[PDB]
Amino acid sequence: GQSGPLPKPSLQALPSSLVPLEKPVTLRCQGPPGVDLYRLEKLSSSRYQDQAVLFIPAMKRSLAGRYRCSYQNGSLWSLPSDQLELVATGVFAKPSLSAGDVTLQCQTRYGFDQFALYKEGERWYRASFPIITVTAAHSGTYRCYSFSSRDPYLWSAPSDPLELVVT
């Protein structure tokens, strides 16, 4: 009577969601045992496939974007998986990264309004301002990406690494 939508499957990208152009990425939709049909779809085109796995040998700009997948067991469809945001990097010239609590500034030229900073393994910092301030000054290697909120999935090449070292 109240048999609602089956539990959402998982949708991940291997080895990662941040995919530089021409590099490989595998999108895998995973549901519990008993799936009769899988369906992976790219939200921008409303074009889906019946296979759980979408392999992209060489990442292209047109393959960047939002993806969701669902599955059917019996005559029941599941909830959609969380949206996988497939990002393409190297779409633009890399920005520059420069300097208890430290503040770094990601400087770009294209006039983008978005930035992403991350400490290699991990920690991400997304901001709509070229000046980010890491709270816990944790020694490590940093890099940032710059992009436009108009195409939030097409990212520049990573900046040269800035090695943070606290004594």
Binding residues (CB under 8 A) for a copy of itself: these are 97-100, 102, 104, 137, 140-141, 160-167
Q: Could you count the other beta carbons within 10 Å of the beta carbon of residue 24?
A: 13
83 part of the interface to Cl ion, by CB under 5 A: no
Environment class of residue 36 by beta-carbon count within 10 Å: exposed (0-12), middle (13-18) or buried (19+)?
exposed
Shortest Cβ 85–a copy of itself spacing (Å): 27
CB 146 within 8 A of CB 106: yes
What does 165 bind: Cl ion, a copy of itself, none (CB cut-off 5 to 8 Å by kind)?
A: a copy of itself
Shortest Cβ 46–Cl ion spacing (Å): 11
Integer Cα distance of 40 and 67 in angstroms: 7
Nearer to a copy of itself, 36 or 160 (CB): 160
- Span interacting with Cl ion, options 18-26, 60-68, 69-77, 128-136, rule CB under 5 A: 60-68
Integer Cα distance of 117 and 100 in angstroms: 18
- What would the two tokens of residue 17 be? 């969601």
Shortest Cβ 38–Cl ion spacing (Å): 21
Cis bond leading into 152, ω under 30°? Answer: no
**Which one, of 88, 13, 83, lies nearest residue 41 by Cα?**
83
Shortest Cβ 68–Cl ion spacing (Å): 11
What does 65 bind: Cl ion, a copy of itself, none (CB cut-off 5 to 8 Å by kind)?
A: Cl ion
The number of angstroms, rounded, from the C-alpha of 130 to the middle of its chain's C-alpha atoms is 20
Shortest Cβ 62–Cl ion spacing (Å): 10
What does 167 bind: Cl ion, a copy of itself, none (CB cut-off 5 to 8 Å by kind)?
A: a copy of itself
Among 26, 44, 103, 133, binds Cl ion (CB under 5 A): 44
